[PDB]
Amino acid sequence: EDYKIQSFDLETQKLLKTALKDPGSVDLEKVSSVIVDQSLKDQVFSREAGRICYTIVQAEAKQTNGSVFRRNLLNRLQQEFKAREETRKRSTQEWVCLVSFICNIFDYLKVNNMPMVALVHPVYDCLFRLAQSDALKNEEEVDCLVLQLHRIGDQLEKMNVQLMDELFNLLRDGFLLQEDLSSMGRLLLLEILEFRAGGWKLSDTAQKYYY
């Protein structure tokens, strides 16, 4: 029904909808390549693509009893991941979009209904980059950091606690240490430092303050 599908070309919107039910009748190499590319660009799509990507792998399991689409999608995405530091120079919009998209994937795309181990260290690599002294300045990127930790921190800690410990050791440093930290960037950090400390819940009293 609704996937916020409009963002795309009207004839691409024809390829995808039919790729939802029938992966055998569509070129899955296109479908994967199509998704990755615009999602980098359209930030709204950087949060709705997960839903779509999963349901496709579910179909190909059902129809071809196989995943080929998943290979193309992961290969396509690992490429863009490796080339991230170049994309961070090229754009912040494009950088934040990619991170947003990788997390969105990790969250919905599952292997026998379990999170893909393959993406743990990648995702943590992104979040560590966003937690750097340079990135904490830019309040496009701090926006991004905390939007992820709001919806996937829970499972990431569960996957690996030491990394999460290090990440939050950086944020604590980035709060005491940093001479210039964005005014409302300072706000969004303290909020998660609490969020996590309360076991990935925002307390009622904290909910009033920040909202």
């Binding site: 290979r71 992961l74 290969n75 292997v111 026998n112 181990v117 393959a118």
Partner: peptide, 19 residues
């Protein structure tokens, strides 16, 4: 793929399909 994620996911899947 030699070290590809898509390879590492296949193996996480195949692992789960073994009792």
């Amino acid at each position: 793929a030699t070290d590809s994620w898509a390879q590492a996911v296949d193996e996480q899947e195949a692992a789960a399909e073994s009792i």
